[PDB]
């Protein structure tokens, strides 16, 4: 029963037809097309069996419509469960004009319903060059989560040599999965990382672990060195929708050099510590109670052992008030600071000292531990109008210490003719008056209406002086001056120092508002006027300690530096942020910064980042003195950061970043590389140089120059992920 023309009849089309014998084979010839839901086979010949049964197209091609999938086979059979099979089959997601990559297997089975394709005697070819063999492979047809290998990552660096990571993904269930990361490192060994992700109706979190038997001996004989390298931790968040909220951020590592050796993904600066925290939080409408157990583990040998807060219990809040009424607030804290000092002495072969442990430079009261309780009620009367406000506030601060000091601290104390009071109290009140005025003005720029505001404010601050030198410092820092300094009731964070203040802060801020309430720009200027000296200081910045070590600033002046600060947004395109702090009493620049960020909304692929940072007024603790310190000539920040990402050709992309430190005249980081994208495959290659954190065997901070090349090819359609890190953090706007 021959047929011709546009023969049509699962649907078996074709230009020609012929049909054949009953119960026997039913053949078909000429431009044959088998079709089905999302399926298509084309070829020269066809053979059917029964009404519902076998099909077999010879010299065939095929196309899976919903995926981008095509291939060819010497022949193709369709069976009962619609499982089509190919012989000498091909599979690819490249366009019909490309041979970018193809999978060629002896048998290739496709199940479009399951979305599962398999191949036996499979080769992966790159531009028809065979690059990888396997006796078996399976791949996904549709883009559902399924377990398997994930796209690998090649690299080569100074710390690891050649590196290969071929992750394996365990798709255990819709709401929890896991991934294995075998890292082969030419220079260290086989490291095995692992992650477990989970999701519940109450909780969400991720487990992480990693092991590696290091073959690198560069750090043999360094303090606290370890041949076995490892890491485990948990992040978890429970009860975001509840008034109870438990939260874990815990990590533990094997040796201090873990991240200095096994990681080049945090970028410059590395990290000196990891967190170990668990927090329970009750969240009521007018008050919050918080149980926080929190400690740090050092990933470094040249920093001092941190305190920990075994139990930190806090209860803050305020009482229901009437509108415009008075307002009562209250904040209460019990904390337990402990710490086990690693002050061991590392000798040479003989008795000569080769290094000093930092904790050994801690003397006297800098070695205390104990309990601190802190109670801080306050009252305030907000008096507001549409155009201004005045809010007076009366606070009372009461802190109690139950200290404990070891033997060496006591001997260090009476060596300085001082005694140790293990029980100390401090009581002092605080008076604060905040006032301001609201001015408005309609304007028009480029034919768009702005509302410009003018907001000037004053805050009088009074806190009596109380010698606090007999107290340790557990949780206190002294922030650098900034415009936000003008409105804080303590020049110190934490509770170990309460600043003596009789001062006035004057400031104004202008804002630019669009019609929808959005804010294009902000400019602010202010200064503080001091009616008394500033006597309360951090240990080693008080007058007694200054002339105990013989130095000498911002102690006795009658005004703060000037504080300027400003932000501007240009349409939805670029953005600029700047701040500047100038000291009139010395005619020098305290700190400053200009940060430009360009990234249009017509094309987020163009990204430019220009940044300058200067800072010379940081107060940091000093490992070798055992005390705090202000002028640190070698820690001055005078740095630029430039980074770019640009599309040279619509499918190519260049990217680079330079980060330069003038204070020492050296590049901190510099890298460049390209990132080409195509229908079926992308490729990213990055040459990189950077200064990595290093603690040498003498307990002295150093840095080493590291170079690296980073390579990732990805064959779209052959597995992958749907959702590098230094490339992410170091270039503002690597988000597409």
């Amino acid at each position: 029963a021959t047929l011709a023309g546009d023969v049509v009849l699962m649907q078996v089309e074709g230009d020609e037809a012929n049909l054949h014998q009953l119960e026997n084979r039913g053949e078909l010839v000429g431009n044959v097309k088998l079709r089905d839901k999302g399926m298509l086979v084309v070829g020269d010949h066809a053979q059917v069996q029964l009404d519902n049964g076998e099909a077999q197209v010879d010299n065939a091609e095929y196309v899976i419509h919903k995926a981008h999938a095509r291939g060819s086979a010497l022949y193709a059979k369709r069976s009962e469960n619609a499982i089509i099979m190919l012989k000498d089959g091909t599979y690819t997601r490249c366009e019909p004009s490309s041979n970018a990559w193809t999978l060629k297997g002896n048998n290739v089975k496709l199940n479009p319903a399951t979305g599962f394709g398999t191949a036996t005697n499979a080769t992966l070819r790159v531009k028809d060059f065979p690059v990888f063999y396997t006796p078996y492979i399976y791949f996904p047809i549709d883009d559902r989560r399924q377990s398997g290998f994930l796209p690998p990552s090649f690299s080569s660096t100074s710390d690891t040599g050649f590196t290969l990571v071929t992750p394996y993904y365990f798709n255990l269930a819709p709401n929890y999965d896991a991934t294995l990361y075998p890292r082969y490192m030419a220079k260290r060994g086989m490291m095995l990382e692992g992650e477990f992700r989970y999701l519940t109706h109450s909780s969400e979190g991720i487990v992480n672990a990693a092991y590696l038997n290091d073959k690198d001996d560069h750090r043999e004989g360094f303090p606290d060195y370890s041949k076995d390298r490892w890491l485990y931790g948990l992040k978890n968040t429970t009860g975001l929708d509840s008034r109870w909220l438990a939260e874990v951020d815990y990590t533990r590592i094997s040796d201090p050099y873990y991240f200095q050796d096994l990681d080049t993904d945090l970028g410059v600066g590395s990290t000196t510590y990891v967190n170990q925290r668990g927090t329970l939080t009750y969240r009521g409408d007018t008050f919050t109670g918080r149980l926080n157990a929190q400690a740090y583990q050092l990933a470094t040998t040249t920093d001092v052992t941190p305190y920990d807060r075994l139990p930190q219990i806090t209860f803050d809040g305020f009482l229901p008030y009437n509108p415009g009424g008075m307002q009562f607030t209250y904040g209460t804290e019990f904390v337990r600071f402990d710490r086990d000092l690693d002050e061991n002495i590392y000798f040479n072969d003989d008795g000569s000292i080769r290094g000093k442990r930092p904790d050994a430079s801690l003397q006297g009261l800098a070695r205390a531990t104990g309990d601190r309780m802190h109670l801080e009620p306050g009252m305030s009367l907000p008096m507001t109008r549409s155009w201004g406000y005045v809010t007076p506030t009366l606070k009372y601060l009461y802190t109690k210490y139950d200290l404990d000091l070891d033997s060496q601290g006591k001997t260090d104390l009476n060596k300085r003719d001082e005694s140790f009071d293990s029980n100390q109290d401090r009581s002092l009140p605080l008076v604060k008056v905040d006032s301001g005025l609201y001015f408005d003005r309609d304007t028009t720029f480029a034919g768009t209406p702005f509302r410009q505001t003018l907001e000037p404010r004053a805050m009088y601050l009074y806190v009596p002086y109380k010698d606090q030198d007999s107290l340790p410092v557990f949780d206190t820092s002294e922030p650098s001056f900034s415009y936000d300094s003008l409105w804080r009731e303590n020049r110190f964070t934490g509770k170990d120092r309460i600043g003596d203040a009789n001062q006035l802060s004057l400031g104004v801020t202008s804002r630019f508002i669009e019609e929808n309430g959005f804010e294009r720009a902000s400019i602010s200027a202010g200064q503080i006027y001091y009616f008394r000296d500033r006597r309360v200081q951090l240990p080693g910045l008080t007058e007694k300690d200054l002339k105990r070590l013989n130095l000498d600033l911002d102690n006795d002046s009658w005004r703060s530096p000037y504080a300027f600060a400003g932000q501007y947004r240009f349409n939805r395109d670029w953005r600029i942020n700047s701040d500047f702090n100038w000291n009139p009493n010395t005619s020098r620049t305290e700190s400053g910064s200009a940060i430009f960020h360009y990234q249009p909304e017509v094309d987020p692929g163009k990204v430019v980042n220009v940044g300058y940072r200067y800072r010379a007024d940081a107060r940091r603790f000093d490992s070798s003195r055992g005390t705090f310190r202000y002028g640190n000539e070698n820690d001055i920040i005078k740095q630029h950061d430039f980074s770019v990402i640009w599309p040279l050709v619509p499918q190519w992309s260049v990217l680079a970043r330079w980060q330069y430190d003038y204070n020492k005249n050296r590049t901190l980081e510099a890298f460049g590389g390209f990132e080409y994208d195509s229908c079926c495959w992308k490729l990213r290659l990055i040459n990189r140089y950077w200064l990595d954190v290093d603690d040498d065997a003498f307990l002295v901070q150093s840095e080493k120059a590291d170079r690296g090349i980073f390579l990732q090819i990805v064959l779209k359609g052959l597995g992958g992920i749907v959702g590098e890190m230094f490339l992410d953090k170091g270039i503002q706007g690597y988000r597409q």
Binding site: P140, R144, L150, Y168, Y169, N171, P174, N175, R197, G723
Partner: peptide
């Protein structure tokens, strides 16, 4: 293999 975001199982 193909890794993606977590999500809750359909219930029916």
């Amino acid at each position: 293999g193909l890794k993606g975001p977590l999500y809750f199982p359909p219930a029916d």
